[PDB]
């Protein structure tokens, strides 16, 4: 009850305890209270002269490092881990398009040639409009790979940012030069006896996160649309009720659409769908970011977010989990073992001990994904009928709101959206990026903050876990306009869109940057002048901090529900919470109270409205 | 009590001088952090997300909040440890590519290509067309491209990897270990260690091996070869060691860190007539520290003031007029210790920023003017030195240095066949590259020198890099006359060649020379590196770069001994994989032994075993 706000989670948690199955909430209590030095960030294991803990003797490390350097180093490596997670996903997308471009990817094509030509033209490919698509693709592959090289002075997509913003980064030393390069430079700087200035460390951490948002994640988003289709607005369902008792239930979990879109195509094969075991159909449901993206591009229903993954298996109806990499809890392998579920992994980078590994690459995806769906149809026969309990009834959601889709709904230009903001019908925009964290009652903060913002005529752009949260709350449909303020509801009914726009997965947060950059460029101001905000009310992962860091560094005020492990240095904390405002035009806000967070987000939005000479 | 800190009299005098002056040393701070955190020492702590942090216990706390066990958690921490060290070398190599490209474009005043012959040879080796006869700047530019591509994401294997025997390359490929890109493997390691990605301890150790190979065969190797191209390939030469290199009558500039791009330009500025005339001092004195000092010693014969733990004690002498630092292994306490005196602590790299220092950023386009400004800062500081607080402890010791692979082969008449013949006869029973640092957990240089003395006594030639250079040098082991401390066979070889029984091959980056030498001997014999009577030791290691070095040695076939254990004892599976499992996979393994004599037995035992596998006595 205190663990989650959802009845489907409640039913599955009670089912888990009766079956003696330990959940992520059960293990969170074992690790609470946690280590104070680890919680403060005042611990360092970067060499075997240590480990060192800073006290308040023990003021410095053995090498002489103070709490400032130690805390900043840990935080840069935290960000580097998150940027690395997106970086590799984007590299994987580059490899796939090259396989298509070279004609070495059976079942893969370029779904959105129009976007390919536009992106290629945008990044400087000559005659991208009229040359053969595979050549245009190959040239774009080269540009992207160069951003994963070490000879650029700035990443390709950075030109989307307003000039004032690009000039600021260059002056500050923040211009991201290469995706992998900045990750390595961060790891270099955090080695003993290298960067021992907390400001320089935070600057490069900002540089590293910008290499994600304007590099790794952005390449990942745009190539995904090129290969799998650009999302259009569409209807679907959410919650554990997406699982059908009468169908073979395949759950795609992780991030890579290269796999999940091939799992979907294999289930649509005539020979596979024919398989014969008491199967009414082959039901595919989404999890995590690969589910978000399958929802965006295919309308496939989503079973749940981060904390719903273990409870999805406990239902007794998950026949298989097809996983790749990132945010896939290893406990899934043990819980699936308690049932019949075949836990299948597909990435060479995402290995789990005890799993069934069927490695998927573009050259063998069609045959391997077809083999995987047969493993699931086999597992559907061994499912115990006694231990099945699908809790809830699914909820309708609308999804597929890319920037392409938003502009289409606005008639082609951002001016109607702009005009609504100048009038005050839409007072501002807040991108909510949150995850789930067992330290917070599940989706309470996410849904509460979302409800507050739309009540104040502030449009919410949702990605990641908040998608399942707002969707379960009925906020992802046009009819949710009745829960928004008069001005925002007026806009939404005019556009036929919900007051919360689902823009995709964690990688797709680059869409929010692209949108902010477009509005800033259209108006001739910096992103730090737009009435925008970002929130991660229930974040947990390195990727969330990398996202939060690149939002702040791009001019977007960013709220965090839980603090990072940096409180052990008040200097680092003050830089993140206040000092960054003077440097990059935005800052971090830490607030566990979602209502106070709405006040803080709205206050900044109001302030930027006044700087534009507008009424709030 | 300070006699237990170091084995050297210059260190003793400075530690006792530090105690009287109330200056806290790295040894004083080591005792404050002992006993350390047990979970951190075991590796059973994880801070990779804010669902945690998590500690594993030995029924609660068996797993992390995400479900991760001690195996995954310990392996993740160790992979990130390796990634930090590879990252340190990676960026140094990237800096040298940037420098050669500046030379190649004519945008680097004072920089030239010292070794055109090596440039043409390296370019030809990596596939540059007509590298032998085309203009040097074009040859350089084409080589710059090859190196940058190894810092890209489109190669299937790094360029220098072809030096390895085919059998070794086939093994890496089968295992999934082939390093594809320098930065790529670092990022992939960080990706794998994110929550919910690689949760298989075997896969994690494999990629850590892949990442370290991207260093030794990539970052460090590019760093070594381009450095020789730009600053000269080391030839054997004489020099002095210890704190006595500092002259009371001269302006004392200490270069500390790693980048020769700066230190070789600091040396040239001191040789300028106006700068040398500006110095009321008797001379301008440049001395080496850490790895940049190793490299100035190798290529210029510049004396070295001391190793890792001697850096703070160098300032306490009261004679260090300036410290020119860049990045890596430069303790931030140096800024506070220098503040107690007149010393100007100068930093030059954008990547190595220290709070409170005098920052004069050095890049190839402005090095000549900036380094000239830095030497003037030091000449200014020479006037502000208090004569009362100066006490230079010891008298310097003669050393011989400059043993690159080029130098070794030259001493052998051009081919490794004489070196090979001595090994088949048994005059040289094997080779051990000692890579150690210093660690306040061990009496300074005790284990290093003790192991070195034991090995040469058993006819085992020692190849020294890094800190052990100052260690063996202070012990009189770096001169031809040190043959009297070796066995009959090894002493016999050394007298024939006129070389010491311990060969100084450079800095930590220069450990790639040892790989190049092993690869050459293995290729010449038609066997794997795992078939050679070779070993590696880091008796007093501490840093991420040392663990990356040890990991890439093990992964290339070289048995590697560590004096102190890494933070992995919390998982017996990871420990057994490092200590035994790797032997079945890569033909070599880690050996953990704090007793240097037992370490010599362990190193010699493996050497003996590989001699038998080659059919030798
Ligand atoms: S880098 Fe410094 S603070 Fe960190 S463990 Fe090593 S000695 Fe301690
Ligand atoms: S990644 Fe897993 S083990 Fe590490 S802190 Fe997070 S929940 Fe704990
Ligand atoms: S566990 Fe070692 S400090 Fe937190």
CA atoms of B290 and B304, how far apart (whole Å): 8
CA atoms of A198 and A68, how far apart (whole Å): 6
CA atoms of A198 and B517, how far apart (whole Å): 41
C-alpha distances in Å from residue A500, one per residue of A25, A461, A469, B20: 29, 6, 11, 69
Determine the length of chain B.
Answer: 617
Residue A458 has what DSSP assignment? E
CA atoms of A468 and A459, how far apart (whole Å): 17
| The three-state (H, E, C) secondary structure of A301-359, written as one string | CEEECCCHHHHHHHCCCCCEEEECCCCCCCHHHHHHHCCCCEEEECCCCCCECCCEECC
Residues 6+ apart with CB under 8 A from A372: A263, A266, A320, A322, A344, A346, A358
As annotated, the binding site of B for [2Fe-2S] cluster includes 37, 40, 45
> For strand B358-359 and strand B344-347, is the pairing parallel, antiparallel, or unpaired?
parallel
C-alpha distances in Å from residue B585, one per residue of A354, B393, B557, B596: 21, 50, 10, 27
CA atoms of A422 and A20, how far apart (whole Å): 57
Closest CA to A402 of A609, A250, A224: A224
- The tokens for A75 are 């935080």
Which three-class secondary structure state does DSSP give residue B14? helix
> Which residues line the pocket of ligand 3, CB cutoff 6 A?
A 35, 37-38, 43, 53; B 37, 39-40, 45, 55
Residues 6+ apart with CB under 8 A from B185: B86, B179, B207, B210, B211, B213, B214
Cβ–Cβ below 8 Å for B50 and A327:
no
Phi, psi (degrees; rounded to nearest 5) at A233: -65, 135
**What are the beta bridge partners of residue A532?**
A429
Residue A229 has what DSSP assignment? -
Atom of ligand 1 nearest to the CA of B29: 7
CA atoms of B309 and B467, how far apart (whole Å): 9
Among B65, B194, B203, beta carbon nearest to A542: B194
Distance from CA of A3 to the nearest CA of B (A): 14
Q: What is the CA radius of gyration of chain B?
A: 23
The answer to whether the beta carbons of residues A609 and A601 sit under 8 Å apart is no
- Residue A267: CB within 6 Å of ligand 1? no
Q: Is the peptide bond preceding residue A33 cis, with omega within 30 degrees of 0? A: yes
Among A51, A348, A564, beta carbon nearest to B40: A51
Residues 6+ apart with CB under 8 A from A255: A89, A288, A289, A290, A324, A325, A326, A327, A505, A506, A507
Residue B444 has what DSSP assignment? B
CA atoms of B590 and B604, how far apart (whole Å): 14
Which three-class secondary structure state does DSSP give residue A295? helix
- The tokens for A247 are 């169908």
Residue that the structure tokens 């040789």 belong to: B271
CA atoms of A313 and A19, how far apart (whole Å): 12
Closest CA to A514 of A7, A33, A31, A119: A119
Closest CA to B328 of B84, B550, B553, B547: B84
Residue that the structure tokens 């940057």 belong to: A513
**What are the beta bridge partners of residue A560?**
A536, A590
The answer to whether the beta carbons of residues B79 and B187 sit under 8 Å apart is no
**What are the beta bridge partners of residue A236?**
A397
Residue A43 is assigned to a ligand binding site: yes
- The tokens for A131 are 């040359």
Residues 6+ apart with CB under 8 A from A525: A162, A164, A612
Residue A453 has what DSSP assignment? H
**Candidates A37, A43, A45, A49: which one to mutate for ligand 1, based on the most atoms within 8 Å of Cβ?**
A49
- Residue A61: CB within 6 Å of ligand 1? yes
Domains of chain B: 59-234 (1.20.1270.30), 235-402 (3.40.50.2030), 405-617 (3.40.50.2030)
Residue that the structure tokens 């040289």 belong to: B428
Among A145, A349, A438, beta carbon nearest to B154: A145
Cβ–Cβ below 8 Å for B151 and A150:
yes
CA atoms of A460 and A428, how far apart (whole Å): 9
| The three-state (H, E, C) secondary structure of A4-57, written as one string | ECCHHHHHHHHHHHHCCCCCHHHHHHHCCCCCHHHHHCCEECCCCCCCEECCCC
Q: Is the peptide bond preceding residue B262 cis, with omega within 30 degrees of 0? A: no
Residue of chain B with shortest Cα separation from A564: B50
Which ligand places an atom closest to the C-alpha of B75?
2
Cβ–Cβ below 8 Å for B355 and A69:
yes
| Run of H or E including B285 | strand B283-289
Residue that the structure tokens 């840093």 belong to: B543
- The tokens for A84 are 């690395």
Neighbours of A354 (CB within 10 A): 12
CA pseudo-torsion sign A412, A413, A418, A420: negative
Residue of chain A with shortest Cα separation from B567: A48
Residues 6+ apart with CB under 8 A from B551: B82, B208, B209, B211, B212
Exposure on the CB side of residue A469, measured as CA atoms within 13 A: 32
CA atoms of A327 and A322, how far apart (whole Å): 13
The answer to whether the beta carbons of residues A220 and A507 sit under 8 Å apart is yes
Atom of ligand 1 nearest to the CA of A191: 1
The answer to whether the beta carbons of residues B322 and B346 sit under 8 Å apart is yes
CA atoms of B525 and B531, how far apart (whole Å): 10
> For strand A282-287 and strand A248-253, is the pairing parallel, antiparallel, or unpaired?
parallel
CA atoms of B617 and B606, how far apart (whole Å): 13
The answer to whether the beta carbons of residues A511 and A401 sit under 8 Å apart is no
Please indicate the experimental technique that yielded this structure.
X-ray
Cβ–Cβ below 8 Å for B197 and A57:
no
The answer to whether the beta carbons of residues B364 and B341 sit under 8 Å apart is no
Atom of ligand 2 nearest to the CA of B54: 8
CA atoms of A592 and A599, how far apart (whole Å): 12
Closest CA to B433 of B582, B311, B588: B588
Burial of A248 (0-12, 13-18, 19+ CB in 10 A): buried
CA atoms of B475 and B471, how far apart (whole Å): 7
Atom of ligand 3 nearest to the CA of B38: 2
- The tokens for B202 are 């075997």
CA atoms of B367 and B263, how far apart (whole Å): 10
The answer to whether the beta carbons of residues A282 and A341 sit under 8 Å apart is no
CA atoms of B36 and A62, how far apart (whole Å): 11
C-alpha distances in Å from residue A200, one per residue of A207, A312, A423, B131, B347: 10, 44, 41, 41, 13
Residue A47 is assigned to a ligand binding site: yes
Residue that the structure tokens 């290691």 belong to: B541
Residue that the structure tokens 């500092």 belong to: B246
C-alpha distances in Å from residue A367, one per residue of A228, A256, A262, A406: 18, 17, 9, 36
**Candidates B33, B35, B39, B73: which one to mutate for ligand 3, based on the most atoms within 8 Å of Cβ?**
B39
Neighbours of A453 (CB within 10 A): 30
Among A50, A60, A184, beta carbon nearest to B91: A184
**Candidates B40, B43, B73: which one to mutate for ligand 2, based on the most atoms within 8 Å of Cβ?**
B73
Which three-class secondary structure state does DSSP give residue A234? strand
Residue to test with chain A: of B96, B150, B196, B542, most A Cβ within 10 A? B196
- The tokens for A245 are 């008792």
Resolution in Å equals: 2.6
CA pseudo-torsion sign B302, B308, B310, B311: positive
Helices and strands counted in chain A (H then E): 26, 16
C-alpha distances in Å from residue B322, one per residue of A75, A414, B190: 32, 59, 37
| Residue A321, Ramachandran bin (φ over 0: left; ψ between -120 and 50: alpha; else beta) | beta
Cα diameter, chain B: 74
Among A57, A151, A439, beta carbon nearest to B32: A57
Closest CA to B571 of B66, B208, B46, B186: B46
Neighbours of B297 (CB within 10 A): 28
CA atoms of B236 and B504, how far apart (whole Å): 9
> For strand A428-432 and strand A395-399, is the pairing parallel, antiparallel, or unpaired?
unpaired
CA atoms of B268 and B108, how far apart (whole Å): 14
CA atoms of A613 and B16, how far apart (whole Å): 68
Closest CA to A195 of B327, B177, B462: B327
After which residues does chain B break, using C–N > 2.5 Å? 58, 279
- Residue A344: CB within 6 Å of ligand 1? no
C-alpha distances in Å from residue B498, one per residue of B239, B399, B453, B478, B482: 16, 13, 19, 12, 11
C-alpha distances in Å from residue A296, one per residue of A224, A266, A289: 11, 19, 10
Residues 6+ apart with CB under 8 A from B178: B156, B157, B161, B169, B172, B210, B213
SS3 content of chain A, % helix, strand, coil (to 5): 50, 10, 35
Cβ–Cβ below 8 Å for B181 and A179:
no
After which residues does chain A break, using C–N > 2.5 Å? 56, 275
CA atoms of B103 and B106, how far apart (whole Å): 5
CA atoms of A553 and A176, how far apart (whole Å): 11
> For strand B283-289 and strand B304-306, is the pairing parallel, antiparallel, or unpaired?
parallel
The answer to whether the beta carbons of residues B604 and B457 sit under 8 Å apart is no
Residue A213 has what DSSP assignment? I
Q: What is the dihedral of CA A390, A391, A397, A403, to 10 degrees?
A: -70
Beta strands in A203-299 (DSSP E): 234-238, 248-253, 282-287
**What are the beta bridge partners of residue A480?**
none
Distance from CA of A402 to the nearest CA of B (A): 27
Instruction: Identify all chain B residues contacting A542, using CB atoms and an 8 Å cutoff.
Output: 48-49, 194-195
**Candidates B39, B50, B53, B56: which one to mutate for ligand 2, based on the most atoms within 8 Å of Cβ?**
B53
- The tokens for B199 are 């949760």
- Residue A62: CB within 6 Å of ligand 1? yes
Helix axis angle, A179-189 to A198-211, nearest 10°: 160
CA atoms of B290 and B256, how far apart (whole Å): 6
Neighbours of B7 (CB within 10 A): 19
Residue of chain A with shortest Cα separation from B67: A331
Residues 6+ apart with CB under 8 A from B423: B429, B430, B533, B616
Burial of B214 (0-12, 13-18, 19+ CB in 10 A): buried
Cβ–Cβ below 8 Å for A46 and B148:
no
Residue that the structure tokens 């990026």 belong to: A433
Neighbours of A133 (CB within 10 A): 17
Closest CA to A307 of A373, A239, A407: A239
**Whose Cα sits closest to atom 4 in ligand 3?**
A38
**Whose Cα sits closest to atom 6 in ligand 1?**
A47
CA atoms of B280 and B258, how far apart (whole Å): 31
End-to-end CA distance of chain A: 39
Closest CA to B430 of B307, B582, B609, B309: B609
Atom of ligand 3 nearest to the CA of B36: 2
Residue that the structure tokens 């005042």 belong to: A42
- The tokens for B489 are 């066979």
CA atoms of A209 and A179, how far apart (whole Å): 9
CA atoms of A448 and A593, how far apart (whole Å): 9
Residue A455 has what DSSP assignment? H
**Whose Cα sits closest to atom 1 in ligand 2?**
B195
SS3 content of chain B, % helix, strand, coil (to 5): 50, 10, 35
CA atoms of B274 and B369, how far apart (whole Å): 13
CA atoms of B287 and B294, how far apart (whole Å): 10
The answer to whether the beta carbons of residues A197 and B355 sit under 8 Å apart is yes
Which ligand places an atom closest to the C-alpha of A58?
1
Closest CA to B152 of A314, A48, A141: A141
C-alpha distances in Å from residue B474, one per residue of B25, B317, B448: 21, 18, 12
Residues 6+ apart with CB under 8 A from B46: B52, B53, B54, B55, B64, B68, B73, B76, B77
CA atoms of B204 and B77, how far apart (whole Å): 10
CA atoms of B188 and A434, how far apart (whole Å): 25
**What are the beta bridge partners of residue A252?**
A286, A322
CA atoms of B473 and B486, how far apart (whole Å): 15
Phi, psi (degrees; rounded to nearest 5) at A352: -130, 130
The answer to whether the beta carbons of residues B253 and B271 sit under 8 Å apart is no
Residue that the structure tokens 């960067």 belong to: A195
CA angle A241, A246, A251 (to 5 degrees): 55
- Residue A192: CB within 6 Å of ligand 1? yes
The answer to whether the beta carbons of residues A360 and A350 sit under 8 Å apart is no
Residue that the structure tokens 């004396």 belong to: B303
């Amino acid at each position: 009850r205190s663990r989650s706000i959802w009845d489907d989670a409640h039913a599955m948690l009670e089912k888990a305890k009766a079956e003696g199955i330990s959940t992520v909430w059960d293990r969170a209590a074992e690790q609470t209270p946690a280590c104070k030095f680890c919680e403060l960030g005042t611990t360092c294991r970067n060499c075997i002269m240590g480990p060192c803990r800073i006290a308040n003797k023990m003021r410095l490390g053995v090498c002489g490092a103070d709490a400032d350097v130690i805390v900043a180093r840990n935080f840069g490596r935290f960000i580097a881990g998150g940027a690395a997670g997106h970086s590799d996903h984007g590299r994987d997308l580059i490899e796939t398009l090259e396989a298509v471009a070279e004609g070495k990817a059976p079942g893969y094509t370029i779904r959105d040639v129009a976007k390919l030509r536009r992106i290629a033209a945008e990044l400087g490919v000559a005659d991208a409009a009229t040359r053969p698509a595979h050549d245009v693709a190959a040239d774009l592959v080269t540009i992207c790979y160069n951003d994963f090289g070490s000879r650029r002075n700035a990443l390709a997509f950075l030109a989307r940012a307003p000039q004032v913003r690009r000039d600021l980064w260059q002056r500050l030393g923040m211009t991201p030069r290469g995706v992998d390069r900045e990750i390595a430079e961060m790891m270099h700087r955090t080695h003993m006896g290298c960067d021992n200035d907390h400001t320089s460390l935070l600057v490069h951490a900002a540089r590293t996160a910008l290499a994600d948002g304007w590099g790794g994640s952005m390449i990942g988003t745009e190539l995904s649309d090129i290969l799998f289709g650009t999302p259009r607005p569409r209807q679907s369902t959410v919650n554990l009720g997406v699982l059908r008792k009468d169908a073979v239930n395949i759950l795609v979990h992780g991030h890579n659409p290269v796999v999940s879109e091939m799992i979907l195509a294999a289930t649509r094969e005539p020979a596979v769908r024919q398989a014969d075991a008491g199967a009414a159909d082959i039901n595919v449901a989404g999890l995590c970011c690969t589910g978000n993206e399958l929802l965006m591009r295919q309308g496939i229903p989503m079973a749940g977010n981060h904390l719903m993954t273990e409870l999805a298996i406990v239902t007794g109806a998950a026949d298989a989990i097809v996983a790749d990499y990132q945010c896939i809890m290893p406990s899934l392998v043990q819980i699936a073992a308690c049932y019949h579920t075949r836990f299948v992994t597909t990435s060479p980078k995402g290995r789990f001990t005890g799993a069934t590994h069927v490695e998927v690459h573009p050259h063998n995806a069609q045959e391997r994904c077809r083999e995987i769906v047969m493993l699931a149809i086999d597992a559907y026969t061994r499912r115990d009928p006694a231990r099945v309990d699908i809790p809830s009834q699914p909820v309708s959601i609308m999804s597929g709101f890319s920037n392409e889709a938003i502009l289409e709904a606005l008639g082609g230009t951002p001016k109607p959206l702009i005009d609504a903001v100048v009038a005050g019908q839409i007072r501002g925009f807040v991108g909510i990026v949150g995850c789930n964290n067992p330290k917070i009652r599940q989706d309470s903060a996410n849904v509460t903050l979302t409800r507050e913002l739309i009540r104040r005529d502030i449009m919410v752009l949702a990605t990641g876990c908040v998608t399942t949260a707002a969707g379960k709350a009925g906020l992802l449909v046009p009819e949710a306009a009745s829960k928004a303020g008069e001005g925002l509801a007026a806009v939404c009914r005019s556009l036929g869109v919900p007051p919360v726009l689902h823009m995709g997965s964690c990688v797709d947060n680059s869409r929010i940057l692209q949108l902010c950059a477009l509005l800033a460029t259209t108006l001739g101001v910096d992103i730090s002048d737009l009435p925008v905000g970002a929130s991660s009310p229930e974040w947990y992962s390195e990727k969330a901090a990398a996202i939060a860091m690149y939002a702040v560094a791009s001019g977007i005020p960013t709220h965090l529900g839980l603090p990072p492990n940096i409180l052990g240095s008040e200097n680092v904390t003050a830089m993140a919470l206040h000092g960054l405002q003077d440097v990059v035009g935005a800052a971090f806000m830490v607030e566990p109270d979602p209502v106070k967070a709405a006040d803080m987000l709205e206050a900044h939005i109001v302030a930027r409205r006044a700087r534009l000479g507008l009424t709030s």
